[PDB]
């Protein structure tokens, strides 16, 4: 199987990719989320379902495996992580593509479809767009009744307990799909640079609410997301009504879905990467 990992430049940054599959073959791009997260996880869970696509994994701007950028949080915009997709694809010489994301990188998938008509169509797994919707589910985590502001919401959550005890308890609706992904992802010995969050957070990512931008989508668009995936779900359900995207719910799935429900992902993700040829195979 070709694979070519290297650092790539694009300009403002140098980026880890895993350029896989046939060179010639339909293209995706993978869009992990975080913000300041890695792809490490999410190959291990999509690879096996993405056999005759060529598939670039890669880590985001200064995130997990990428070049550390300079101290300056101007760096970290949606925009240029949008911006960093289409440099990518140009700098592999791929023309037209279409997206995976999972969690926070919905909005850039739905950023990047919105500006560039390169990009064919999207399959968001688990997509994060509300973050004070995000914000009050914390604190609801934490036993609190939610107020109007987010990032209060995310201060007083994190008062009474460490953001991974919140964030553990909305992703993982098991011990042991928690400690399968736990050993996974210590097992890649990544270690992540906490500038990205730390930058997105101070730019006002908690106050993101991606929603009032979500309109129909003529391209083939799929929405994948875990029934306990506090996270992500029941929101979702607004996502694929706003973009007039299927979705499929998983029973007994958390926001890593493969892991927690991997028979019922792998009939949800064919279908979806199916989905993504209408002209041959027809709509949904």
Do not use: C
């Amino acid at each position: 199987m070709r694979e070519e990992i290297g650092y790539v430049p694009v300009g403002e940054a140098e980026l880890y990719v895993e350029d896989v599959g046939p060179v010639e073959g339909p293209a995706l791009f993978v869009l992990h989320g975080g913000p300041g997260g890695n792809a490490y996880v999410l190959r291990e869970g999509l690879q096996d379902y993405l056999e005759g696509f060529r598939v670039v994994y890669f880590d985001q701007r200064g995130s997990g495996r990428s070049l550390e950028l300079p101290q300056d949080p101007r760096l970290f915009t949606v925009d240029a992580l949008v911006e960093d997709t289409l440099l990518l694809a140009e700098a592999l010489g791929v023309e037209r593509f279409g997206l995976l994301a999972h969690g926070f990188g919905a909005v850039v998938a739905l950023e990047v479809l919105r500006r560039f008509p390169q990009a064919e169509g999207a399959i968001l797994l688990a997509p994060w767009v509300n973050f004070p919707w995000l914000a009050a589910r914390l604190a609801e985590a934490a036993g609190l009744a939610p107020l109007p502001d987010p990032e209060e919401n995310l201060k007083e959550a994190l008062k009474r307990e460490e953001p991974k005890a919140l964030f553990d308890r909305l992703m993982f609706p098991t011990p042991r799909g928690r400690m399968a992904y736990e050993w996974l992802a210590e097992g890649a010995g990544i270690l992540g640079s906490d500038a990205p969050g730390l930058a997105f957070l101070r730019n006002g990512l908690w106050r993101l609410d991606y929603t009032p931008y979500l309109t129909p989508e003529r391209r083939p668009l799929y929405v994948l997301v875990g029934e306990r995936d506090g996270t992500s779900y029941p929101y979702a359900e607004e996502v694929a009504s706003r973009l007039r995207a299927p979705i499929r719910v998983l029973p007994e799935a958390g926001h890593y879905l493969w892991i927690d429900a991997p028979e019922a992902f792998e009939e949800a993700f064919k279908e979806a990467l199916a989905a993504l040829v209408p002209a041959l195979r027809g709509p949904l």
